[PDB]
Amino acid sequence: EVYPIDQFMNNTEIWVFNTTQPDPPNCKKDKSKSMTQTATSFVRSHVKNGNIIEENLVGNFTYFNDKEKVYDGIYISGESSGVYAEHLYYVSEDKKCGLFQVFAHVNDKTTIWRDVRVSGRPEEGVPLELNCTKEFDEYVKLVNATSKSPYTSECQ
Amino acid sequence: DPVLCFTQYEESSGKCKGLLGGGVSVEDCCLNTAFAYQKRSGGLCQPCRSPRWSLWSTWAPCSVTCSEGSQLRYRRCVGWNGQCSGKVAPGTLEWQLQACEDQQAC
Amino acid sequence: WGPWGPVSPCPVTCGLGQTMEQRTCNCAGDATRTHICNTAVPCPVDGEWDSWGEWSPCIRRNMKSISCQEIPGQQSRGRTCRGRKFDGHRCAGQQQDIRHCYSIQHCPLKGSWSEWSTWGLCMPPCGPNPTRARQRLCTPLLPKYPPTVSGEKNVTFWGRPLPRCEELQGQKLVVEEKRPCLHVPACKDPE
Ligand SMILES: *[C@@H]1O[C@@H](C)[C@@H](O)[C@@H](O[C@@H]2O[C@H](CO)[C@@H](O)[C@H](O)[C@H]2O)[C@@H]1O
Ligand SMILES: *[C@H]1O[C@H](CO)[C@@H](O)[C@H](O)[C@@H]1O
Ligand SMILES: *[C@H]1O[C@H](CO)[C@@H](O)[C@H](O)[C@@H]1O
Ligand SMILES: *[C@H]1O[C@H](CO)[C@@H](O)[C@H](O)[C@@H]1O
Ligand SMILES: *[C@H]1O[C@H](CO)[C@@H](O)[C@H](O)[C@@H]1O
Ligand SMILES: *[C@H]1O[C@H](CO)[C@@H](O)[C@H](O)[C@@H]1O
Ligand SMILES: *[C@H]1O[C@H](CO)[C@@H](O)[C@H](O)[C@@H]1O
Ligand SMILES: *[C@H]1O[C@H](CO)[C@@H](O)[C@H](O)[C@@H]1O
Ligand SMILES: *[C@H]1O[C@H](CO)[C@@H](O)[C@H](O)[C@@H]1O
Ligand SMILES: *[C@H]1O[C@H](CO)[C@@H](O)[C@H](O)[C@@H]1O
């Protein structure tokens, strides 16, 4: 099945809680500003040397699924980390946990990683749905990837 | 309309063999799926087994003096009581046309 | 000529057969006269395998998504015993076909332009001014995955990726050349 990326991203803040991106910057998050019928305009934020960097991006909705009835991905042009595509492949029952395939290409190297993203400020003593985190842990074990959390409670 | 009923069909260059005779309906002839029939005394023999495409013929020679030419090849829907691939009726041919060069194409 | 003797019992138990009668000189012409006999009973018809058809999607039990990753899943395809009738034989062999796969289904990849394919067939055959085509295709850079064994078993790439290459002559996926087929013979039906 295919969960709608246009529904998941129509929320105020989406935080990256866990990722296999090599050496990710701290406090990676997306803040929706205005979604259209075929694309969403949003602000991608992250911390570098204590400085908040903001990219104003447009993600054009597309389909990675076979039925081509529910949007589940976005193409992004000019993202500063080279991310050109994102594919939403799982959303939790409480709709607070989402699993992403991220495709990036920067100077003749195209790479892939995965994210766990939360549709709101994560909580301290409330873990995400066990199926959501378990599929990601199984991916990490099956690929011999190193996982890191970009999120901290001090993120603005 | 009575047909000619044969006991054998020859999978290669499809031809009827082992004539029983000529006063029978197709239904009775093809009660035995190993059998084959003919419309009238010397035309196309259709086997009674379910329709399926025949093997492509060998490539016919290609019309050239010395240059590049072209050549044809064919196959036929052969059988009875049904249809071959692509909702096609028994007897219908399919053709393929290939470019050809006999010599160095002088 | 004596009288025609009786017709022998039909020698087949289904479909048509040939029964003869004989005569004795008690004489020019036929001592024997054959006839077709109808049993009116249909013979058995053995079933025959259909074609395999398309592969099911590449999936791993208890993994929602494998695409674009070096994670074997597995796939199956089926075929149906068709036409078995009036007590004919059932089909022999495996009904289901199974294999291990890597999913590159809908994975956007960097591409490079392939070399030219060979010229296709002349289309339409027998039609007016038949022309043939060849194409240059945007091929994604295929990953170097190991064909090892998840037991020693094969793992096949499966799925249609979305390759990204620089545009060549105004096209992003397929560049096509046509060329007439020349000196076309005519399709004389052999009957
Ligand atoms: C007599 O009873 C019939 C029901 C059939 O089972 C006969 O066998 C059939 O004999 C013909 C040969 O004329 C074959 O074409 C069939 O394949 C075979 O099943 C049986 O002799
Ligand atoms: C024609 O095409 C190929 C041989 O060229 C085979 O699959 C088969 O002979 C078919 O009838
Ligand atoms: C036609 O094409 C070639 C002959 O050059 C062979 O593969 C075969 O004879 C086919 O029928
Ligand atoms: C055979 O043909 C008929 C019987 O059907 C008769 O004219 C005669 O018995 C002949 O021998
Ligand atoms: C036998 O066949 C017929 C008789 O019915 C005649 O042509 C002739 O008597 C021959 O001996
Ligand atoms: C199934 O297996 C292959 C197709 O991949 C062929 O030999 C044939 O189509 C068969 O039905
Ligand atoms: C599935 O596997 C490949 C496609 O990747 C083909 O051999 C065929 O389509 C089969 O059904
Ligand atoms: C397209 O494919 C590659 C670039 O992706 C190059 O070989 C060349 O630019 C070609 O036109
Ligand atoms: C196709 O055309 C010619 C050779 O046929 C070359 O320029 C090159 O191989 C291209 O792929
Ligand atoms: C197209 O033209 C020649 C002659 O037919 C072929 O041999 C070759 O495959 C090329 O692609």
Residue numbers in the entry:
A (entry chain C): 48 to 203
B (entry chain A): 28 to 133
C (entry chain B): 260 to 285, 296 to 419, 425 to 465
Paper passage:
In this study, we identify a family of complement inhibitors from the hard tick Rhipicephalus pulchellus, hereafter termed CirpA (Complement inhibitor from R. pulchellus of the alternative pathway). Functional and structural characterisation reveals that members of the CirpA family directly bind to properdin, inhibiting its ability to promote complement activation, and leading to potent inhibition of the complement response in a species specific manner. Whilst many molecules act to control inappropriate activation, Properdin is the only known positive regulator of the human complement system. All CirpA structures share a lipocalin fold with a short N-terminal α-helix followed by an eight-stranded beta-barrel and a longer C-terminal α-helix.
We chose to work with a minimal properdin construct that had previously been used to determine the crystal structure of pseudo-monomeric, minimal functional unit of properdin (hereafter referred to as FPΔ2,3). The addition of CirpA1 to purified FPΔ2,3 results in a distinct shift of molecular weight, as measured by SEC-MALS, indicating the formation of a complex at 1:1 stoichiometry. We were able to obtain crystals from the FPΔ2,3-CirpA1 complex and determine its structure to 3.4 Å by X-ray crystallography. CirpA1 binds properdin at TSR5 and 6, in immediate proximity to the convertase binding region. Analysis of the interaction surface, which is burying 864 Å2, reveals complementary charged patches, suggesting that binding is mediated by electrostatic interactions. In CirpA1, properdin binding leads to structural changes in the three C-terminal beta strands, as well as specific rearrangements of individual amino acids contributing to complex stability. One example is Q148 which forms a hydrogen bond to properdin Q338. Another CirpA1 residue undergoing a conformational rearrangement upon properdin binding is Y122 which forms a hydrophobic pocket around properdin P377 together with CirpA1 residues F122, Y131, and F150. We, therefore, rationalise that binding of CirpA1 impacts the conformational freedom of the stirrup loops thereby destabilising the interaction with C3b and possibly preventing conformational changes required for binding to the convertase.
